């Protein structure tokens, strides 16, 4: 119920950097496997499916839960892709990643599932915990000196925190100013393509 | 009814108890059912390594 | 029966059936006596029989052998017949 295999293979297949940089993605222009350099047809399904899989492997969400997110966004009022990206960003592991306390979303999932975090006073070990507005995520007092935590404390200045979060790095406290908007989620997929895909 | 027996390999014979599922064989007039390999007397195809579940072949170490 | 409550109940049901049957048969006999007096056309005999039958119908209704509505219906029939006889 969690993808544990290599991520560079998925990034190469999907054609975009799922996470990180300056890595084995120097072989980017071609998917993994023996048949990587051949010319591709890329149907509309192919395109749509690529966008959906890009979002899925970026956020570490499997198909059933991603589908559930899709119906929630579709029911919600407003743009379906905007709401879907808003939900995926409101996931707690992504919140930790965006605040910059984790090197990657996989590391954020690791620490969240291991329970190194407090949500507004209550301990949460659910990576899919949907953080609500005005929430206060806190690092567990016992685990305020994790090696990944201190690496993040050394590196966060380079990292860019989105406008909808406030982070007290050394304190391990992520204040949620508001639930993010499409202009605030970084554009790296085609949510419109995903929405069109979930209609066929 | 007449039932097809899929897969390379066959053991079932006269008065062998079988499980019969739906399924048409297009180039066979009058065959509208197939025999479920790996159930009751009929057994899985011997040398399967791909699509084993559809032929009732247990996984090999 | 399989329940001792139910065995007790069949015994008491038989007892109540005897009681109710006796009372109903007495009611029927009294009403028949009034009807035969009315057919004979007597006035005093029919009046006395009607009084007796109505009193017994009310007594049975009080005892619960018959419903008060049934007692009222039969009393009404008897009284109307007696009035027709008098007229």
């Amino acid at each position: 119920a969690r993808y544990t295999g290599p991520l560079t293979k998925k990034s190469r297949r999907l054609g975009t950097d799922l996470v990180g940089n300056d890595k084995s993605f120097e072989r980017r222009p071609y998917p993994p496997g023996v048949h990587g350099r051949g010319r591709t047809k890329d149907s509309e399904y192919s395109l749509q499916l690529r966008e959906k899989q890009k979002a899925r492997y970026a956020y570490g969400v499997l198909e059933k839960q991603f589908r559930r997110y899709y119906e929630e966004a579709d029911r919600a009022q407003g743009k379906t892709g905007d709401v879907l990206l808003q939900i995926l960003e409101s996931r707690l592991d992504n919140v930790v990643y965006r605040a910059g306390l984790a090197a990657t979303r996989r590391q954020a999932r690791q620490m969240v599932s291991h329970g190194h975090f407090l949500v507004n006073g209550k301990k949460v070990n659910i990576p899919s915990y949907r953080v609500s507005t005005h929430d206060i995520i806190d690092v567990r007092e016992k685990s305020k000196d994790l090696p990944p935590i201190v690496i993040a404390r050394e590196t966060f200045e380079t990292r860019d925190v989105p406008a909808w979060l406030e982070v007290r790095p050394n304190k391990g406290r992520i204040l949620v100013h508001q639930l993010p908007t499409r202009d605030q989620i970084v554009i790296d997929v085609n949510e419109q393509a995903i929405v069109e895909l979930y209609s066929k | 009814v007449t039932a097809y027996i899929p897969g390379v390999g066959h053991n079932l014979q006269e008065h062998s108890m079988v499980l019969v599922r739906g399924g048409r064989v297009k180039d066979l007039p009058g065959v509208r059912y197939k025999i479920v390999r790996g159930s009751l007397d009929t057994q899985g195809v011997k040398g399967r390594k791909q699509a084993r579940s559809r032929y009732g072949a247990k996984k090999e170490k | 029966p399989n329940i001792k409550s139910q065995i007790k109940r069949v015994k008491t049901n038989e007892k109540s059936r005897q009681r109710n049957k006796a009372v109903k048969s007495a009611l029927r006999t009294y009403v028949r006596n009034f009807r035969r007096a009315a057919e004979a056309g007597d006035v005093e005999a029919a009046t006395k029989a009607a009084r007796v039958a109505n009193r017994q119908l009310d007594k049975a209704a009080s005892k619960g052998v018959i419903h008060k509505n049934q007692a009222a219906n039969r009393k009404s029939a008897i009284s109307k017949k007696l009035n027709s006889l008098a007229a």
């Binding site: 005005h134 206060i136 305020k144 201190v150 007290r168 050394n170 304190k171 391990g172 204040l175 | - | -």
Partner: protein, 128 residues
Amino acid sequence: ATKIRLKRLGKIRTPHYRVVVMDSRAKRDGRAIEEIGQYHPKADPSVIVIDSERVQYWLGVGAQPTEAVVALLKRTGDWQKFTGDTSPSGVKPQPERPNKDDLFNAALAEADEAPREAITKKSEGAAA
């Protein structure tokens, strides 16, 4: 007889009762003549909401409460208004009150010791 009783609802190991009015012969979780209140005992200082006018009407018309509903009416004070008896009538204590916006504004500004205990944990990694 008409009863004022509790109709069980909710999950396994999580009961929420509806103080309802129905006759004795009816099944426990069935059609009710009227729904009067709710009773959540699983929650802290159990929640007890009873419609005073309706419960007074049903008591005055002759509905018989179950012992649980008698306890709830004692706590709501209805069991004293009807069948006047000397009982404490301990109207439910509230199950306290949290808040979110005030805490967020308190911490947004908290700053100071936020990043301050934060550089203290910097000294901690030093100690780490």
